[PDB]
Amino acid sequence: VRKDPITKEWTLEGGALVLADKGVCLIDEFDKMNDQDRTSIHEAMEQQSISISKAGIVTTLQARCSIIAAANPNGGRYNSTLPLAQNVSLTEPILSA
DNA sequence: CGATCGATCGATCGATCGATCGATCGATCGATCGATCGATCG
Numbered sequence: 001v002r003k004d005p006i007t008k009e010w011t012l013e014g015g016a017l018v019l020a021d022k023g024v025c026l027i028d029e030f031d032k033m034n035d036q037d038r039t040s041i042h043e044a045m046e047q048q049s050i051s052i053s054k055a056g057i058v059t060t061l062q063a064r065c066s067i068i069a070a071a072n073p074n075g076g077r078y079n080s081t082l083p084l085a086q087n088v089s090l091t092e093p094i095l096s097a
Numbered sequence: 098c099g100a101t102c103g104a105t106c107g108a109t110c111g112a113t114c115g116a117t118c119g120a121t122c123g124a125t126c127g128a129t130c131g132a133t134c135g136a137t138c139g
Binding site (some may be wrong): 005034 | 125134135
């Protein structure tokens with residue numbers, strides 16, 4: 001959110017997902033971010049849009065981006081005897097995306 | 098007539114394990130602070 005003296009209403013400036021609209025968004029070390037940060041990424045791939053209600057601004061922006069994510073398994077080594085759904089903290093609904 | 102032996106059963110030492118509990122280290126959600134600026138007022 002940014003101020004603007006010309007019109008005096010709050011103006012909104014987009015983040016990384018808005019930039020990558022009709023592009024690719026790369027998230028290295030995807031597991032290490034918190035779930036609140038990770039929740040935004042999930043709804044970004046599903047809806048291809050950003051929904052925000054902050055500073056009195058309610059609007060939606062286009063976020064049509066492709067995602068390439070790198071991560072690491074729990075303990076730094078992949079457990080070959082357990083499924084993927086039990087090797088990372090990344091929850092299953094986010095894996096389905 | 099009895100002297101030798103290979104098998105069986107009861108009992109015990111012990112080496113071990115499962116269920117349960119409180120205690121130790123740690124992730125992390127919530128509270129507070131701060132820094133620049135803006136809107137109202139004198």
